Amino acid sequence: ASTDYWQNWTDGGGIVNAVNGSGGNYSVNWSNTGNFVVGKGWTTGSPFRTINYNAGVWAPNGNGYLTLYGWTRSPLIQYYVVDSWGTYRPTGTYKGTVKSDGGTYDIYTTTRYNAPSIDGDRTTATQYWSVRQSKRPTGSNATITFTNHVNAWKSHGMNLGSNWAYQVMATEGYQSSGSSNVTVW
């Protein structure tokens, strides 16, 4: 059930060369950036979606995340499933672990002031994280069975909102350079 959403946001710092490729493909080549989020996915996320991707390039030089990225409203909550990163492994308040798709993820919560909002304005964001304990190998087809994460979060008292905004497989960077090329389906 194909992607229908193109995410491309930058704070304006540095160079963020994002290409919206055919189908579910995109690429980013970025240099000395502020914060940016680029990805492909769906306009209306679902807690039951299996996200398929293949990162044919994952080459951050500094802080970049290769991550599921989405939001709910009512209440407003941002969520991440981070499969790989660059020089920084994102963490927060430790909640527990979840096993999914061949990997083990630590579960964290954070609250970020002046965080990017759904539309690239700002907000105080309540964030739920699953962060893989080691960087996922890239270049082969990969699955994120998102219901495993949703169910794990719920069991640890982390409930999502009733209204679903977009749900993308993203490259997020901060204060970094790099290259990524990802196809999502």
Residues near Zn ion (CB under 5 A): 96, 119, 121
Q: Is the CB of 96 or the CB of 102 nearer to Zn ion?
A: 96
Q: CB 155 → Zn ion: shortest distance, Å?
A: 5
Q: Is the CB of 17 or the CB of 119 nearer to Zn ion?
A: 119
As a whole number of angstroms, the distance between CA 65 and CA 173 comes to: 6
Q: Is the CB of 30 or the CB of 79 nearer to Zn ion?
A: 79
Helix (H), strand (E) at residue 36 = strand 36-42
Q: CB 98 → Zn ion: shortest distance, Å?
A: 7
- Largest Cα separation within the chain, whole Å, is 41
Tokens representing 116 are: 């990017």
Q: CB 105 → Zn ion: shortest distance, Å?
A: 11
148 phi/psi in degrees, rounded to 5: -60, -40
Q: CB 100 → Zn ion: shortest distance, Å?
A: 12
As a whole number of angstroms, the distance between CA 128 and CA 160 comes to: 9
Q: Is the CB of 38 or the CB of 165 nearer to Zn ion?
A: 165
As a whole number of angstroms, the distance between CA 79 and CA 81 comes to: 7
As a whole number of angstroms, the distance between CA 7 and CA 130 comes to: 21
Q: Closest Cα partner for 160 from 74, 85, 96, 54?
A: 74
Q: Which residue is at the shortest CB distance from Zn ion? A: 121
Q: What is the C-alpha end-to-end distance of the chain, expressed in Å?
A: 7
Q: CB 123 → Zn ion: shortest distance, Å?
A: 8
Q: Is the CB of 66 or the CB of 82 nearer to Zn ion?
A: 82
